Amino acid sequence: GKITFYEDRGFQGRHYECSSDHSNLQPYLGRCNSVRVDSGCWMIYEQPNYLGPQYFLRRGDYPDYQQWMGLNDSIRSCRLIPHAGSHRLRLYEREDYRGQMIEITEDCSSLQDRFHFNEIHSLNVLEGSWVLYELPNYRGRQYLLRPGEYRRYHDWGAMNAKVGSLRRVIDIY
Amino acid sequence: GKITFYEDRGFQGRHYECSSDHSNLQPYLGRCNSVRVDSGCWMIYEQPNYLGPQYFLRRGDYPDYQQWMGLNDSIRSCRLIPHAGSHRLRLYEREDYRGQMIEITEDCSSLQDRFHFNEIHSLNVLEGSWVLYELPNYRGRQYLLRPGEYRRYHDWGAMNAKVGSLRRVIDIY
C-alpha cells in the first residue's frame, strides 16, 4: 500500500510517505491535516505505538482531518491492513466467550436492529480484519479488529462494550 | 410454537430456540444434528429464505437428523405452520389444472394405491397446510403445501411430478 501524510490542509506542507506500518511518525511529520491514500486500507492513530483514537482510511484523497472523521490533526502511527479474501467473526454476549454467540461474515450497519444486541463483551476474529464502530451506520469511535481473540472489550481498546456497527476491511480495487 | 435447534446429536452443543419464522439461522447455528420441538408444527429448510430440501417436524424430540429424515446437518431456515381446523386439496392430472381432478380432505398413505396416480402436475390447496411426500407412507422428499395454487411441480419446489403420500398438517401441541 502507499499513504502520504501532509502537515497542512489540501495536500500542502511537509509530507511523509509510508508503504508500511509506522509506529511513530513524530520525527517526520509534525501534525497531519490532509492525507492521500494511493493504495491499501490503513488505520491511523492519534499517538505513537498504535495508541489513542484510530481512524480507518481506504484509497482516496482526504483534504482535511474531518474527511476521515478525525477529531484533530494529531496522527502519530499507522498500520497497513492486509487484504483478506474472506471475513468471519464471532461476537459473544459475555466476557471470555460466554453467553449467546453470533457469527457473522458480512457488514452489519446496525447490531441492535439486526440482532438486538447493543454491546459485545468478547470476540474471536476468525478471518479478515474488520472495523468495529461504537455507533450504527459506521460512526462513532472506531476500533480495528484483526484476526485473533479478544476476551474483554478492553482488548480491542474500547472504553466500554458498546458496539453499533461492523464493517469488513476490503480493498477499493 | 417453540422449537430448539442443537449443533450436535443428542441435544448437545450450541443451541438456538425459536418461536417464530426465521429466514436465516446461519448466525445462530453452524449446523443442526438435533431438535427438540416443544410446540407447533414446523418446516425446517436446508437453506436460508425457505429454500432447498424441507422437513416437517411436530412436537417431540429428534436426537439426530435421520429422525426428521434429513439429508445432512444443514438447517438454515424454519417456519411455524399455522394450524387450521380443516383441510381440502384438489390434485390435477395435468399442469395448469387440466385433466382429472381429485379432491381430498384426508391423509393419503398411498396415492398410487388409492387413486392410481403416481404423479400430480398441478394442485390447488383450498384449506389447511399439507405435506406432500415423494413416496408412500410418508417418506422420501417432503414439500410443504400452503393454501394457494400451484400450476406446476416446480411451484411446490420439487424436482419432478412424483407424489407418493399426502398428510394434513395437524397438531398434537
From Swiss-Prot, chains A, B:
GO terms for molecular function: structural constituent of eye lens. Disulfide bonds: none annotated. The keyword Nucleotide-binding does not apply. It holds the Pfam family Crystall. It comes from the Eukaryota. Residues 1-39, 40-82, 87-127, 128-170 form the Beta/gamma crystallin 'Greek key' domain. Residues 83-86 are annotated as: Connecting peptide. Crystallins are the dominant structural components of the vertebrate eye lens. This is Gamma-crystallin D. It comes from Bos taurus (Bovine). The lineage of its organism: Eukaryota, Metazoa, Chordata, Craniata, Vertebrata.
